[PDB]
Structures are given as structure tokens and as C-alpha cells.
């Protein structure tokens, strides 16, 4: 049907907006602490601690797979990345501290993207 082509025209573009948002959030991580999944070779016990690992390269794959339905789905992934880090690493660490900075700086980007989804539709 044509009404599935127009549905996809929204999805395609959400993906197109969600790409931009991801890029701005990943610029708030110049150290690349959150770029890749945590290595299970290097932290073999990681899954004993964090039941749902999340990272930028993982979030990207799923975006280019038009795998995100709304902005709430994308925001949940982003929060995993931070909340996981904030549990795994102790407070006095470059990792924890980097999550706090990403959280704080991401709030501004996300606060506008909510407004751009709602406004565009």
C-alpha cells in the first residue's frame, strides 16, 4: 500500500533526525569512553554487573537499521550508556566522571530534539 510508503517516509526521516542527534551526543564524548561496547575479553565479568550493555556503535547499527520507533526508544539507550557506567565504575573515576559530563551536556541536545520531533510530527 501507499499508506506504508508514507509511514516509512516518517520513519526514514526520524532516522535522518536521529542520526544528527547521535552525532552531537557522541561529540560530547571526545575521549571515546562510550564509543564501543565494553570488551568482554578485558572485562570478562562485565555481564555479571550490567545486564543490558549499551554503547554508541551499538546505537548507530540499530539506527541505520531504522530500528528506533520513536525518540523515547533512542533516549532509553542513551541513558543505559550513562547509568551502566555510573554503576560499574566508582565515583572517583575518569569513567564515572565522563558519564556525568555526557549526561549534563546531553540534556541540552535532547531537550531540543524532543521539541523537533513534536513540532515536525
Domain ranges of the chain: 1-121
Contact (Cβ atoms closer than 8 angstroms) between residue 106 and residue 100: no
The three three-digit cell numbers of residue 95, written as one number: 569513567
Distance CA 62, CA 89 (A): 26
What are the helix (H) ranges across 28-70? 46-49, 56-64
Distance CA 75, CA 110 (A): 8
3-class DSSP state of 85: helix
Distance CA 48, CA 112 (A): 36
Question: What b/e readout covers 48-83, taking b as 16+ CB neighbours within 10 angstroms?
Answer: eebeebbbbeebbeebeeeebeebeebeebbebbbe
What CATH architecture is 1-121? Up-down Bundle (1.20)
The three three-digit cell numbers of residue 4, written as one number: 506504508
Kind and range of the H or E element at 39?
A: none
**Cα dihedral 13, 77, 110, 71 in deg (nearest 10):** 40
The three three-digit cell numbers of residue 102, written as one number: 555526557
Amino acid at each position: 500500500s501507499m499508506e506504508q510508503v508514507a509511514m516509512e517516509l516518517r520513519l526514514t526521516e526520524l532516522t535522518r533526525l536521529l542520526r544528527s542527534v547521535l552525532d552531537q551526543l557522541q561529540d560530547k564524548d571526545p575521549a571515546r569512553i562510550f564509543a564501543q561496547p565494553v570488551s568482554l575479553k578485558e572485562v570478562p565479568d562485565y555481564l555479571d554487573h550490567i545486564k543490558h550493555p549499551m554503547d554508541f556503535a551499538t546505537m548507530r547499527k540499530r539506527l541505520e537499521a531504522q530500528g528506533y520507533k520513536n525518540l523515547h526508544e533512542f533516549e532509553e539507550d542513551f541513558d543505559l550508556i550513562i547509568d551502566n557506567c555510573m554503576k560499574y565504575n566508582a565515583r572517583d573515576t575518569v569513567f564515572y566522571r565522563a558519564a556525568v559530563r555526557l549526561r549534563d551536556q546531553g540534556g541540552v541536545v535532547l531537550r531540543q530534539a524532543r521539541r523537533e520531533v513534536d513540532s515536525i510530527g
